[model samples]
Target: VRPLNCIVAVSQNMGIGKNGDLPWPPLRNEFKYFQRMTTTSSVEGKQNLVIMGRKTWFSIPEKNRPLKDRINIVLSRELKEPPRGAHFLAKSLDDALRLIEQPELASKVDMVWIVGGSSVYQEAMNQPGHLRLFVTRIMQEFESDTFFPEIDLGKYKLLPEYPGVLSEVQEEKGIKYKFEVYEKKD
Candidate 1:
C-alpha cells in the first residue's frame, strides 16, 4: 500500500503554478521546510521517492534533476530512458511503486512523494486511502495558469501541530503562508 503524500505550495485560490513554474517570487523559509520534510526519513539510511509527471519532472533544472538524496521516479510512457538523470522511468505510478518496492530498492525507500503537474495529484486523490497532504497555504493570490486538484475537505482532519513540522505562520518577502498537513479521517 502506498501512503502517498503530496508536497505542494498552493495559493489562496489553490493555484500551484504559472507557465509551468511557481507563480510567487520566493518563500525561502517555506522552501527549506519542503526540503527538510522531503529528505527526512525515520530510518537513518532510507531515502524518499519523488513521483512526478513528465512536465513536472522537466520543470526542475537539469542540475537538480534527481533532487539530492531522494530517489526520482518519472511517470511517463513516452520516454524510453530516464530523462537526463532520473533514477528510474516508469510507465505509470503503480510501475514506479513496483520499481521501488523491488528487493533491491525496497529497503532504501521510506516514503513516496506525489510532486505534481495536476493529473498525478488527481490519481492519488482518487484512490481510497489516506493521503498525507503536505500543503503550504500561501496567503496571497497570484495570476496562475496551473491549479491544484480539488479534494473533499471534509474527509481530512487538519493537524494543528506536527512533530518535526514548524507550526507557526511564516512570513517571507511580505508573503505570509502556513505549512499545513492533513491526514485522512478513518
Candidate 2:
C-alpha cells in the first residue's frame, strides 16, 4: 500500500481554523516549510498528490490554486466536475485514493498527502497501512472554531526525529511552534 500522509498545523487546543480560515496570523517560515514538504520528490519526474476537502480547496487563495508542483484533487460530492483550478475531483476520500492506486497514476505519484478541513482528517486516520502525520504544534492558543481530531495514541507513535524536519521548537513573529512526525504503528 502507498504511504498516506496528512499535513497540518494546530494550536494548543488542537484548533485548526476559525471563521473558515487560519486562526493565527501568517507565519512565513511555516508556510515555506509546508511548500517544501509537499512539493519535494524522491523520484525524479514523479509528483506528489495533495487531496483536500471542498472547503479546504476553496480556502486556498485564487492566485495559489493547484499548489504548484503537486497533483491537486479536491474531494467533493456537490460539484459535478473538478473545480476550475483543481486537477481532479473525487466524490469522497476513498474514491480519490482509489484514483491514485490505478495503473496510470500509480507510476507517476510519489506520495499522497491529505490537506484537510475536519471530516477529511477524521476519515483518513481510520484508513489502514503506512500513514504519517506531519504536524506543526502551534504553542499559542487561538479562538478557533474548527479543530483537528484528537490523535489516537494507540495507532500512531511519535518519531523522535524525522528527516528534513527540524527537531527544535521554532519561533516567528513572537509565536512559538515545533514540527512533529507521527507514524502509524504496523
Candidate 3:
C-alpha cells in the first residue's frame, strides 16, 4: 500500500455558508472566500483523495455529493452506507489509514487529503507520517461553533504561500486569503 501524504483544509475554524456568508458574522463568507482562494479545479480528475469528518460531510450539499470527480472518503463514528456515493468509509482515523494501506487501493492514488471538521484533522496530524498540509488564513473573525486545533508552528515548516486575489462579492464580505502549505520535519 502507498503511504498517506497530504492534508488540505479550506477553513480550520468553520466552513462558510453556501451564499458566501460566514454563517455568523465578521468573517462572513468564509466558505466562498476559501473556495476562491484554494480551488484547484484544473486538477479535478487527478487521483487526489479527500477524507473528511461527519460534520464536514454533512456540510456539503447533496447535489454536490462525491465532490465531483475526486475520491470522497468520509470518517465517522456513526455513519453507514457511505453517504450516497462516497468512495470509502473509515470509522476512525486509524481505519482511514488501513483503507489506504490496502495493496489494491494504494497504487492507484497519488495523494490523500484529510479535509475536516476538527477531530479528523487532529487525529491525522497526530499520526506518524510526513504530511503536507494546506491552510487558508482569513483576515476576518467570526463567531464559530467549530474550530481548528492549535498547531505548533515549530513542528511544521512553512513550504510556500500562494498569494490570492480579493474576490468581489455583492455582500459586505470581501475576501483575501493565501494558500499556506506546511510539512512535518524529520
lDDT of 3 by residue, 112-183 (tens): 666665677777778776766666565445545556666678997876443343333233446454446677
Question: For residues 6-79, what per-residue lDDT tens digits would candidate 1 score against the true structure?
Answer: 88999999888789788999677876888888888778788988888999878876776678888888889898
Best by lDDT: 2
Off by over 4 Å in 3: 1-46, 160-173
Q: Model 2, which residues run further than 4 Å from truth?
A: none
**RMSD after CA superposition, every candidate:** 1.6, 1.0, 5.2
> Which sections of candidate 1 miss by over 4 Å?
none
lDDT for each residue of candidate 2 in 1-186, tens digit (9 for 90 to 100): 288889999999998988878999989999998889988987888998899999988888889887999999998889998889799999988898888999999889998888877899989988778889999999999999899988877888999999889989899999999999999955
Q: Backbone clashes in each candidate structure, one number apiece?
A: 0, 0, 5
The true-versus-predicted C-alpha distance at residue 18 of model 1, in Å, is: 0.8
TM-score of each: 0.93, 0.97, 0.73
The positional error of residue 40 in candidate 2, measured at the CA in angstroms, is: 0.5
Of 2 and 3, the candidate ranking higher by lDDT: 2
| Backbone clash total, candidate 2 | 0
lDDT for model 3: 0.60
